[PDB]
């Protein structure tokens, strides 16, 4: 997941099983004040949902990650 | 001698799972899934194929312009010219016979 | 309709070490190049000149770089020079022998 942050400009999150792509995009924009290019989601084998969130070119995912608290 | 595989989950040779073999810019053979061939529209009266009408699957006619789907004549994309000719001759002669 | 084609072979590196004889190498091509059949039919069609540093072959007959490389490799094996001398191509129809 960390490789996709620095290289792909993509943030990886664990999200609730009831949330769709519209709600994930809305939540990220207000929680982290960023613009979202697109969202890809999958259901992991352990029963949780993982979302690949790619930010627009105006934002850098690495700067968001270290501001959130994880590097 | 390169061998190919299906690119979908269907493993059987049905009408919707037909393939063609093409060579890619990468220099290898790869299967290409092909859609079923279209059928020409037929005349309403005699059943023969209509001249000047595009041949497409039913849903594709909504994307093309009207000039591809009709002929500049009465019953253009419905009846062929010969059947339209028969209709006009029959209509005139029968109505004249009615007066007499 | 048969414009002449020039093949240049550079032997500068092997002759510097002295384990190569450009004069003998050019003479081998004289008695081994086949033209429209067997050896010895060079009826002013194939010429192999020499200046002491390069080998020039100009031919108006069936000749190719692959054939030139084929004959050169035969000469190197005869004198047991395959382990040191390599026939390499630099540009189109221009070659050299690498000593390494």
């Amino acid at each position: 997941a960390m490789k996709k942050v620095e290289d792909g400009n993509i943030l990886v999150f664990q999200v609730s099983m009831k949330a769709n792509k519209y709600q994930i995009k809305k939540a990220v924009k207000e929680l982290y004040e960023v613009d979202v290019l697109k969202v890809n989601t999958l259901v992991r084998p352990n029963g949780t949902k993982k979302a690949y969130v790619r930010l627009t070119a105006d934002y850098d995912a690495l700067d968001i990650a270290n501001r959130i608290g994880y590097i | 001698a390169q061998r190919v595989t299906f690119r979908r989950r269907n493993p059987y040779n049905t009408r919707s799972n037909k393939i063609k073999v093409v060579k890619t810019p990468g220099g290898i053979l790869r299967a290409q899934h092909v859609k079923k061939l279209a059928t020409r529209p037929k005349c309403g009266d005699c059943g023969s194929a209509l001249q000047g009408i595009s041949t497409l699957r039913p849903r594709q006619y909504a994307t093309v312009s009207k000039t591809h789907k009709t002929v500049s004549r009465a019953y253009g994309g419905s009846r062929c010219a010969n059947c339209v000719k028969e209709r006009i001759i029959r209509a005139f002669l029968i109505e004249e016979q009615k007066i007499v | 309709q048969k414009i002449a084609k020039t093949f240049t072979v550079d032997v500068s590196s092997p002759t510097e070490n002295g384990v190569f004889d450009p004069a003998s190498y050019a003479k081998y091509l004289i008695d081994h190049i086949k033209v429209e059949g067997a050896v010895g039919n060079l009826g002013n069609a194939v010429t192999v000149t020499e200046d002491g540093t390069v080998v020039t072959v100009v031919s108006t007959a069936k000749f190719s770089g692959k054939y030139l490389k084929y004959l050169t490799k035969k000469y190197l094996k005869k004198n047991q020079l395959r382990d040191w001398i390599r026939f390499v191509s630099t540009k189109t129809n221009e070659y050299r022998l690498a000593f390494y």
Binding site: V43, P45, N46, G47 | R9 | -
Partner: protein, 50 residues
Amino acid sequence: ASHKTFRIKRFLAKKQKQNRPIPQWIQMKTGNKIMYNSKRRHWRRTKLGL
């Protein structure tokens, strides 16, 4: 199979999480008599019956 319903996949996810050893720190609790997980499952020995 690769094609599976959501219910089947959810059922398989729970069975994966239940197939793990017992933590060691639990064995040192007062009045503890549990030694090994008696409901351990291997994919090639006992089938889920699904």
